[PDB]
Amino acid sequence: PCEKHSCIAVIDAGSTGSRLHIYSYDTDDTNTPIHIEEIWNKKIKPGFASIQPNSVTIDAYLTMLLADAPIHNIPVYFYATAGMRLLPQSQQKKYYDELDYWFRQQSQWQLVEAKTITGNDEALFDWLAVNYKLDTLKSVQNKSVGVMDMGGASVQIVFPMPKNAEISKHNQVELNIYGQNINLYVHSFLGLGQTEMSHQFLNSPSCFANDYPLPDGESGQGNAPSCKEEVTSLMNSVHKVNQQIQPLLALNPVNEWYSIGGISNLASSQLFHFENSELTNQSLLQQGDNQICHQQWDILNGQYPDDEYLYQYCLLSSYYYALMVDGYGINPNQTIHYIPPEQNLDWTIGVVLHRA
């Protein structure tokens, strides 16, 4: 396949593991990739930031990730995300030093770049990946498409916005895709991903089902509106999500919202019911409140003993609402599309489009 087409490997070194994607593609007369096809996909655990940065450990890890790969001599991008951003730069440097050394010795993998990408770059790739799959990149669009990525340690938001001298250059991207100039606003909130966020609310009774045992000895007494208010304080009083994002969405309205990441998992669980891979925040909060927050934990756990994430669904439904409604200012009745978890839609497609 890499015989008659171009090929690229992109490694997503994420929070819970690393995923190797190998893509074939052709290039059109705008110097933009087309016919992007994933020819190989392998995931290993644990996350890169959770292993020791030495030559023995890195070799085992990278050998495991790449060894069976049926396609050999191709350029590689190794991109780590928020899990690595949480580590001191001096600690990150150890990983990248070892990784450069490992790839040098491999005559079959040509390492182009290995780095911890910013949340802003991640947001750019998120937007490219979704829009590529919706087939909205090829021609100048009537409608504005926004993407929200709901990650473990960070969340990203990205939408079209003309160049603005009053906004940090770090929050703005310019790119040309299929011959058209695009200007995007990008933002990442490090610490507001669901795992990192959750560590501030583990002892909040309003955020767990009735009688759920909290770490410090109290009991769950769930109430989604109360939990949502607690989470909103982290969003707005600490991160100032509302102050930063709402003015920009007011002035640069989004016609269609697409969400990727954790929300797709929650919405696709047996506890929530949504049609057409779409939800509204109003519905999400109401369902979380009724089906989890105000249930008895023992009864709930007995009906669904196989979902290890169930216990968190009161907090998560409250958190998504706090983020989208209280943070981003999205109307509770606004349709939000979520990309089905089973779908071969991954942010690494954006790396192909932008960097291949």
List the beta strands (DSSP E) in the chain.
6-13, 18-27, 33-44, 74-80, 109-116, 145-150, 154-160, 172-177, 180-190, 256-261, 278-280, 335-338
| Residue 303 touching its own copies (CB under 8 A) | no
Between CA 237 and CA 245, with CA 242 as vertex, the angle to 5 degrees is 140
| Residue 196 touching Na ion (CB under 5 A) | yes
Nearer to its own copies, 70 or 302 (CB): 302
Query: Using the rule CB under 8 A, which residue among 3, 29, 56, 89 binds its own copies?
Result: 89
Taking a C-beta distance cutoff of 8 angstroms, is the pair 116, 127 a contact? no
Q: Nearest Cα to 36, choosing from 71, 1, 77?
A: 1
> Would you say 15 is a known binding-site residue?
yes
Query: One symbol per residue from 77 to 116: x for binding Na ion (CB under 5 A), - otherwise; what is it?
Result: --------------------------x--x----------
Beta bridge partners, 80, equal: 13, 116
The entry of Na ion, its own copies, none near residue 90 (CB within 5 to 8 angstroms by kind) is: its own copies
Nearer to Na ion, 114 or 352 (CB): 114
Taking a C-beta distance cutoff of 8 angstroms, is the pair 35, 26 a contact? yes
> Would you say 2 is a known binding-site residue?
yes
| Residue 15 touching Na ion (CB under 5 A) | no
Distance of CA 127 to the CA centre of its chain: 11
The CA distance from 321 to 286, in Å, is 10
Nearer to Na ion, 4 or 199 (CB): 199
Beta bridge partners, 180, equal: 177
Rounded to 5 degrees, φ, ψ at 268 are -85, 5
Which helix (H) or strand (E) segment holds residue 41: the answer is: strand 33-44
| Residue 169 touching Na ion (CB under 5 A) | no
Beta bridge partners, 160, equal: 184
What DSSP assignment string belongs to 332-345? TTSEEEE--TTS--
* Smallest distance from Na ion to CB 110, Å: 5
Between CA 315 and CA 320, with CA 318 as vertex, the angle to 5 degrees is 105
Nearer to Na ion, 300 or 323 (CB): 323
Query: One symbol per residue from 184 to 223: x for binding its own copies (CB under 8 A), - otherwise; what is it?
Result: ----x-xx----x--xxxxx---------x-xxxx-----
| Residue 16 touching its own copies (CB under 8 A) | no
Q: For the chain, how far is it from start to end, CA to CA, in angstroms? A: 16
- Tokens for 264, please give them: 């797709």
| Residue 168 touching its own copies (CB under 8 A) | yes
The entry of its own copies, Na ion, none near residue 216 (CB within 5 to 8 angstroms by kind) is: its own copies
> Would you say 233 is a known binding-site residue?
yes
DSSP H helices in 145-209: 194-198
Query: Using the rule CB under 8 A, which residue among 99, 157, 227, 234 binds its own copies?
Result: 234
- Tokens for 353, please give them: 């489009």
* Smallest distance from its own copies to CB 117, Å: 10
> Would you say 127 is a known binding-site residue?
no
Query: Using the rule CB under 5 A, which residue among 88, 174, 199, 342 binds Na ion?
Result: 199
The entry of Na ion, its own copies, none near residue 106 (CB within 5 to 8 angstroms by kind) is: Na ion
Residues that bind its own copies (CB under 8 A): 50, 85-86, 88-90, 116, 118-120, 153, 168, 170, 188, 190-191, 196, 199-203, 213, 215-218, 230, 233-234, 237-239, 308, 311-312
Binding region for Mg(2+): 2, 103, 106, 109, 233, 237, 270
